[PDB]
Amino acid sequence: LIPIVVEQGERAYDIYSRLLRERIVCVMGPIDDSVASLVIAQLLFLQSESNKKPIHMYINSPGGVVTAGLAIYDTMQYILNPICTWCVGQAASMGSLLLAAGTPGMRHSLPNSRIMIHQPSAIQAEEIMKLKKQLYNIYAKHTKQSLQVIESAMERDRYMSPMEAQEFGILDKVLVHPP
Amino acid sequence: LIPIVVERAYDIYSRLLRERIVCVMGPIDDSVASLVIAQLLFLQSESNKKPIHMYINSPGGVVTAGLAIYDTMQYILNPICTWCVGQAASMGSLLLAAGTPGMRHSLPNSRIMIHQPSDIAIQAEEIMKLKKQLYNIYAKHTKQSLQVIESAMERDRYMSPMEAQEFGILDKVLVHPP
Amino acid sequence: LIPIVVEERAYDIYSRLLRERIVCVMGPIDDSVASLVIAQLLFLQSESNKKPIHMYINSPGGVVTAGLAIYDTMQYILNPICTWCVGQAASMGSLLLAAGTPGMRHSLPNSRIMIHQPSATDIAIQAEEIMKLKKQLYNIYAKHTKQSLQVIESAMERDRYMSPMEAQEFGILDKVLVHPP
Amino acid sequence: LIPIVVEERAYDIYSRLLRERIVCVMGPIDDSVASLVIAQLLFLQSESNKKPIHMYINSPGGVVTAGLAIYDTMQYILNPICTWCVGQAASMGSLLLAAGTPGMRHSLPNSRIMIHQPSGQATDIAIQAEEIMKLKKQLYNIYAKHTKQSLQVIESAMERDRYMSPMEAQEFGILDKVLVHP
Amino acid sequence: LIPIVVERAYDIYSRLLRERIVCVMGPIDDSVASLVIAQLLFLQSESNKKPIHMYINSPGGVVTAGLAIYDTMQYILNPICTWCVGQAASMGSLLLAAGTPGMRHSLPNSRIMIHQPSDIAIQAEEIMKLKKQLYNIYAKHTKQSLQVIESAMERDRYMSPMEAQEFGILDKVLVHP
Amino acid sequence: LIPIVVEERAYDIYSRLLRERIVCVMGPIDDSVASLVIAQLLFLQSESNKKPIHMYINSPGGVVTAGLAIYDTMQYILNPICTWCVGQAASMGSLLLAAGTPGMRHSLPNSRIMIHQPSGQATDIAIQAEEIMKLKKQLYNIYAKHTKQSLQVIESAMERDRYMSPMEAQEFGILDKVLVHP
Amino acid sequence: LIPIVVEERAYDIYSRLLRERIVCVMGPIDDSVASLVIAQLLFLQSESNKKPIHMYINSPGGVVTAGLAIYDTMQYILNPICTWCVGQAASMGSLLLAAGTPGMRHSLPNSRIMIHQPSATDIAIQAEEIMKLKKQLYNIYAKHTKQSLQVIESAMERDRYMSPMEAQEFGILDKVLVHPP
Amino acid sequence: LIPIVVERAYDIYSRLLRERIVCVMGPIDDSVASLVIAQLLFLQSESNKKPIHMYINSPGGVVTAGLAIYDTMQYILNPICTWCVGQAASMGSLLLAAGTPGMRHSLPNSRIMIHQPSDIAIQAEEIMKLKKQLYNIYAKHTKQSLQVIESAMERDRYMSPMEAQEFGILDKVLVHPP
Amino acid sequence: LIPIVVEQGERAYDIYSRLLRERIVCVMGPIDDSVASLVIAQLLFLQSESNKKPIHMYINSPGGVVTAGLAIYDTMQYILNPICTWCVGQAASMGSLLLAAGTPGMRHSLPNSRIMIHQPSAIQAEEIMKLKKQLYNIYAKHTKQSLQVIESAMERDRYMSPMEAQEFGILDKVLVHPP
Ligand SMILES: Cn1c2c(c(=O)n(Cc3ccc(Cl)cc3)c1=O)CN(Cc1cccc(C#N)c1)CC2
Ligand SMILES: Cn1c2c(c(=O)n(Cc3ccc(Cl)cc3)c1=O)CN(Cc1cccc(C#N)c1)CC2
Ligand SMILES: Cn1c2c(c(=O)n(Cc3ccc(Cl)cc3)c1=O)CN(Cc1cccc(C#N)c1)CC2
Ligand SMILES: Cn1c2c(c(=O)n(Cc3ccc(Cl)cc3)c1=O)CN(Cc1cccc(C#N)c1)CC2
Ligand SMILES: Cn1c2c(c(=O)n(Cc3ccc(Cl)cc3)c1=O)CN(Cc1cccc(C#N)c1)CC2
Ligand SMILES: Cn1c2c(c(=O)n(Cc3ccc(Cl)cc3)c1=O)CN(Cc1cccc(C#N)c1)CC2
Ligand SMILES: Cn1c2c(c(=O)n(Cc3ccc(Cl)cc3)c1=O)CN(Cc1cccc(C#N)c1)CC2
Ligand SMILES: Cn1c2c(c(=O)n(Cc3ccc(Cl)cc3)c1=O)CN(Cc1cccc(C#N)c1)CC2
Ligand SMILES: Cn1c2c(c(=O)n(Cc3ccc(Cl)cc3)c1=O)CN(Cc1cccc(C#N)c1)CC2
To answer: What are the GO MF terms of this UniProt record (chains D, F)?
Structure first.
């Protein structure tokens, strides 16, 4: 059960509602059209509190529906707030894409995270390759890698260390403690 | 369901949180990781110097989710007292040993096992990669050499709190509060 | 449905029991029941480390590791603990009952008490770990009943139950009582 | 949906019943039903150590030890206990029914009462043969106690697989009154 | 119950196979493929010039399972008469159009579809490889262009036996013999 | 229904295939599939210690140890083994495919071949991490053995999550011929 | 589908294996697999109490009591027994493999052999019965491998597998071979 | 499925029956009772003097069905050799002890338990009635006193073939044929 | 699996078909409309082999459908052959009725059997009491007890020993060995 915390005059929120107070948005678990709705709702709300106050996106996800992930991505690029993305636990498939789509220089990962841009395996065939050529362009955009490099990197069924993903362009800093 | 205590009224688990106590009950997954990390960061923003007591009674769980909780432990600046009740096995023993040195406790009749019992389908080198991270993290907080960790992590057996204290997993074995 | 009692304030009846320092160990024992009991044990202790807690037990048993944690917390906390057996107390339930403060372990007249372990852990475990559990149970039963290891070992082999009078004679119980004295 | 009434405060209809010192024993009796009923019994005793408690039984039976825990709590508390039988009180339902205070064990006209124990579950774990009859002789004693019938009469009656009318349940010692009106 | 027909006695389907008939019925998988191939190779052993008849009433199935049947049809030397009963969609019509030219028949009420309704989970490039193979096999046997194949194969509709003859899936539409 | 043919005797079509020294490896490879195939392999060897055996593979993979038992039996027997790939030979399917006798490892044109091991079940019991790679290096060795590729090349190729055409599978050392006709 | 081979007579391929005195211990081991193996062991013995029987093993394990019965029958019958490990031989499967006639226990090159018991009986059993099983396994492994109780006890704690060469060195196997010699 | 032996051809279980061998494999119910009794009466009509070998590897079963097989044993006039392999518990140990005296065998590593582990819903006195029949039958074939049976039938434990031979359940403990 | 036995020129039957050769009919397990069909088929067949050669009915049953049991009973009274009924294991509810409906003086039970004429507990109420008043009359017919005695005996949820059932009229002899 989700616990309750008390603020200070006095009011009490559940601890997850309290992270949204600190402009923290959690992207935990697999991604579908409901996670997309919840995340977009919180991303458009925190922009209403301030257009320039940064938002923090915690990503601990194995992937999910591609269109639902693109939906969260398109809302990320839309809003004006900078977004600090934090990779904790793992970020694979659609998860690493939201991770790599943070504001340049604010994409982080904790030391022991695992990062994967390879996509683990009904619509027609050409619509699936349409999706991948989009993911090829987004990953290239934010990593600053070429379409050649992104295509072959997504072929390798394997994970990256935080240091690997940083020197690939996925994230920017690998923190251990607050600076 | 949960009883209600009166101080304003919380339930007994929100009241536990008001005492800076974080429970790690049973199997560990991404939801347990999300809920524990949320309390961990909440407890630090209230005070980065007051310790955080973390109760562990778990048979293990998803390795990444456990590593997620481990890194949040290492991130936050508070002293952290880890407590082992009932058992702490697999990912549970790692969080148990990841407490602040000199503050890792266990109750007398509990059990501790670092043998990893055998979120998506994973290739062979990544399971070896994750097994290697557990090797490093265990050898670091137990001060044991790496060759001693891999051998011990392989005997499919449990340790008594006395045994686990000799190994360097925990520090005190308390029957009552001294 | 859990009813409401109004005292002013309005609790559900189980919350109101905690206002009288009563902790119910009902049904089988898993880690959820363990975590719930320990939460009320550590909470009631901070309300008063010397006011006695009352532990109603009506249980067939449960996970050994989840049960030993409850026992270890009972030995930890400073409060004296009155155990009460209604209905039954079998497997690990009797171990909690026998582990009350000496002289404060009770049972209602028509209860059934068994220390024989039927059939235990959240994970499948090796044969030597199953018996390490059993030898820990032997030590706890010998400690609180003041019986020998020879007697505890052969008593748990009897796939039978004990009357509240037999259990009092064996050492699990102190006072079988039918009315408030 | 459980209705909500208003007495100012507003409970549900069942919390409103408990405020009248009424404890329902509806349906099969298990461990959770036992601790639920027992909690109300000790609560209503703390509010008054001699004000009567009314206990509605419409039960087909259930776990014997769970019902024995309820029976032992009735025997524990000081209050007069007014047991009422509507619909039916079979198996352990009739044990609590007879376990009321002598004089105020009631029933409504069109109910049925059975002391024959149908072969809810019998025990909370599958038990040995000698344990099954240890309970049965415990039931034999508790029945013969509140009926003032001989153990030879309880044993034969519990063998016959049949219900009893409220008037039969009266002439046997199970209950005291068969009311139609107040 | 599969009935018996008669100095010997086979089940009715075993009787059909001595007439050199092969029934591709229902969905197509590796079991259907392994059963059809064992019959295609056996019948060629009896004679590599005697024709073989393939009754097809199929809604489709696994691509690699179907391509194995098609690959075996190309391997064996016998002329192959594909017959379309009820329906032939997805891999079923590709088997139908793979018969010997001039010997691909259809009953007058059948429905044919080359559009593919949307063993291991696989990448997006492997599905497109599959599609390019179904593109080239259709283009090979319907003497149509890859523009005409790719375009028509992505309209979600059925053809009539006369329509399928216009396109090049089959050659003949019999009403009686 | 499995058809019945007539050669006088009359088998089913699959027993008729076995009388042609043809052993099918259809679909996923498990323990029962292994002992079934191995039994045919040793049988066809006793009938003739040097007459070739034809082995049809249309398999997506399966239990590694089960396929390793089949691979070890091919290595055991004396006969030339003619492996054929129709449809696909993924995971351990391509291991047996490459495990044919050098020279007579064939494929049909429209097949696919994958050596990347998809993450049937991997092992017959859930095993430790070091055991999972002990199998993987065993696969690395067996692949590089029959392809005469370096272990560095096998490791990179098995990492890429993709199939290979028969012509790719030829230029890599997996098979020898890509037949369209006899 | 089990094919047919025609010899004249026509058997299914598994029946034809028995004509060559081959007994397949495939898959997990329950009492059905035990009763089937023992039937072919007692039958092949009456055909010739001295012609060797061949025991193909590819098993992850199974019921301990069902497995020990197969072992006891192997020790009973007069025939020498060649054991063969293909694929794997884990838990009780390796115990049958190690219990071949000394000098006639084989394994193909790519097999995996484990004596560590994972996680056993048709009924839930007490902790002392689980270890009595384990101490019987210790005696059988020490007997056939000629290793000591100290080594068998610590080897079964290693949750790992053995190569056919390690198992030959440990005492479970005699001859790893890749071709007919 | 069952292999086929050639002598005419049976399967290996009909071939076992041709050797006057009756299997009692696994749990005992009315179908196992019907099949075993059918072979028992069939074997007697072929010869009421040639012995009948009965293999027991069972965890118990329905008490009535086991009593059904017990009474058919006592009915037929043949000598009966009972064999315990793997285990013989609950109803299984009764049939094991119900063999012809001096001909009850067990293989070395098997287990034997008379503790009855705890066809329609049954009242309390009938379960006591059935428990009493097991008491009498055990005390009769083990020559043990009744008070010794009820105590032993209650320790939730197994006996080694040596133990069960001391108790009087079986007679010989053979490792090979002597 | 049902084993095979060989007769003697030579032919092989399954062991259950071989008991029908010896005019043995098994009534094992619960009774429904299929057991009734099988038993009536074998009872009418053995009468075709001989009108006077006795038939043997083995009964090891807990009960079953009342109408399906009456069906087996009505065929029993119809055929001319005497019927030796043997109670092995148990005979409760409809099972004890077929047991009690054998030829007078040929109803047996082995020593350790359990016998129950009490009926363990969709049609209208009056059709159920119609059924019981039939079972009251059949049990009275063959036991030679009165309707008073049968009604109260079926009230007691309990079993009878073979010696009890013999001295009640249910069976005639309790054998231990062949005479
Ligand atoms: C009416 N409206 C609209 C937008 C907005 O941002 N706000 C301010 C707002 C929003 C939520 C809250 Cl809780 C408080 C204040 C507003 O009021 C933005 N929409 C465009 C848009 C852009 C990106 C993603 C989605 C989705 N899916 C939709 C247009 C309408
Ligand atoms: C915005 N923000 C951020 C952090 C923080 O600690 N606090 C103070 C705070 C936190 C919770 C509450 Cl309820 C009240 C106050 C805050 O406000 C820490 N993040 C970094 C971080 C560190 C370790 C694990 C994860 C994960 N997964 C993320 C960065 C953002
Ligand atoms: C921080 N802390 C700690 C303890 C305590 O008793 N209290 C007072 C308290 C507790 C709950 C509440 Cl609701 C209100 C006040 C506290 O505040 C006791 N812990 C050790 C311990 C002892 C026995 C069992 C377990 C478990 N599992 C853990 C150490 C930390
Ligand atoms: C601490 N305590 C105790 C009792 C009591 O009656 N009251 C007053 C009370 C009770 C409930 C509430 Cl809601 C409010 C006030 C109290 O405060 C009675 N226990 C003995 C007992 C008797 C019968 C059944 C069980 C069970 N199972 C237990 C002993 C403890
Ligand atoms: C040994 N052998 C072989 C073949 C053959 O056609 N015949 C004659 C034969 C076949 C079946 C039967 Cl029942 C009787 C006679 C033969 O004897 C053809 N194989 C290659 C092949 C070709 C097309 C598809 C697959 C598949 N999948 C496999 C090679 C071996
Ligand atoms: C007794 N025996 C043995 C073998 C053999 O090949 N043959 C001839 C034979 C085989 C099957 C049939 Cl149907 C007819 C004749 C024989 O008779 C081969 N075994 C060694 C072996 C080799 C490869 C895999 C396994 C497995 N798993 C086992 C040894 C025994
Ligand atoms: C009657 N009898 C008996 C035995 C025997 O070996 N044979 C020869 C025989 C067996 C099967 C077949 Cl198909 C053909 C001939 C025989 O005839 C061996 N039994 C003792 C025994 C030994 C080892 C395991 C078990 C088990 N479980 C049982 C005693 C009886
Ligand atoms: C007709 N009849 C009868 C019996 C007999 O033994 N035989 C010879 C026979 C039996 C089976 C076969 Cl395959 C071949 C020949 C026979 O022919 C034995 N019954 C008495 C009985 C004894 C013990 C258990 C049950 C049961 N349940 C029944 C009486 C009838
Ligand atoms: C045509 N017919 C009829 C009967 C008969 O007994 N037999 C001789 C026969 C029967 C079966 C076989 Cl295998 C061999 C020979 C015959 O031929 C008896 N039916 C009356 C009847 C009596 C009792 C129960 C049922 C039922 N349900 C039916 C009338 C018809």
So the answer is: ATP-dependent peptidase activity; ATPase binding; endopeptidase activity; identical protein binding; peptidase activity; serine-type endopeptidase activity
C-beta separation of G113 from G95 below 8 A: no
CA gap A98, B175 in Å, rounded: 48
Please give the Cα distance from A68 to A98 (Å, whole number).
11
The token duo for E20 is 């050199």
**Can you tell me the distance from the alpha carbon of C39 to that of H13, in angstroms, rounded to the nearest whole number?**
61
Measured from the Cα of A22, ligand 2's closest atom is 17
> Exposed e or buried b for every residue in D121-130, given b needs 16+ CB within 10 A?
ebbbbebbbb
Does F159 lie at the interface with A, CB-CB under 8 angstroms?
Answer: yes
Contact residues, chain B, for C12 at CB < 8 Å: 4
Ligand nearest to the CA of A55: 2
- Considering all CA atoms of chain D, what is the largest pairwise distance in Å, rounded to the nearest integer? 56
By what method was this entry solved?
X-ray
Cβ contact E112:E164 at 8 Å: yes
Q: How far apart are CA D28 and CA I61, in angstroms?
A: 31
> What single letter denotes the amino acid at residue E93?
S
**Sequence-ordered list of residues with C-beta below 8 angstroms from that of I51, at least 6 positions apart, any chain:** I80, I81
Beta bridge pairs of residue A58: A26, A86
C73–B85 CB contact, under 8 Å: yes
Resolution (A): 3.1
Say how many C-beta atoms besides its own lie within 10 A of residue A151's C-beta. 16
Instruction: Flag whether A touches E (3+ CB pairs, 8 A cutoff).
Output: yes
Residues whose CB falls within 8 Å of the CB of residue F69, separated by 6 or more in sequence, listed in order: F31, F34, F35, F38, G58, G86, G87, G108, G110, G111
Q: Tokens 């079986």 label which residue?
A: H170
Q: Which long-range contacts (CB under 8 A, 24 or more apart) does E32-37 make?
A: E32/E61, E32/E65, E33/E62, E33/E65, E33/E66, E33/E68, E33/E69, E33/F58, E33/F86, E33/F87, E34/F24, E34/F26, E34/F56, E34/F58, E35/F2, E35/F3, E35/F13, E36/E69, E36/E72, E37/E68, E37/E69, E37/E72, E37/F56, E37/F86
Ligand 6 atom closest to F35 (CA): 27
Kindly list the structural domains of chain E, giving each domain's residue range(s) and its CATH number in brackets, ordered by start.
Answer: 4-173 (3.90.226.10)
Q: Measure the CA–CA gap between C174 and G158, rounded to whole angstroms.
A: 47
| A88 C-beta closer than 6 A to ligand 2 | yes
**What is the nearest CA distance from G159 to chain F, expressed in angstroms?**
7
How far, rounded to the nearest angstrom, does the alpha carbon of residue I85 sit from its chain's CA centroid? 6
**CA angle (G18 as vertex; G16, G24 as ends), nearest 5:** 110
Q: I84 - beta bridge partners?
A: I56
Task: Quote the CA–CA distance of E106 and E57 in Å, as a whole number.
Answer: 10
Q: Evaluate whether C50 touches B84 at the Cβ level (below 8 Å).
A: no
Helix then strand then coil, in percent of chain D rounded to 5, is 40, 20, 40
CA distance I130 to I137: 11
Element (H, E) at E21: strand E21-25
Q: Which residues pair with G81 in a beta bridge?
A: G53
Q: CB neighbours (10 Å) of residue B49?
A: 8
SS (H, E, C) chain A: CCCEEEECCCEEEEHHHHHHHCCEEEEECCECHHHHHHHHHHHHHHHHHCCCCCEEEEEEECCECHHHHHHHHHHHHHCCCCEEEEEEEEEECHHHHHHHCCCCCCEEECCCCEEECCCCCCCCHHHHHHHHHHHHHHHHHHHCCCHHHHHHHCCECCCECHHHHHCCCCCCECCCCCC
Strands E21-25 and E10-11: unpaired
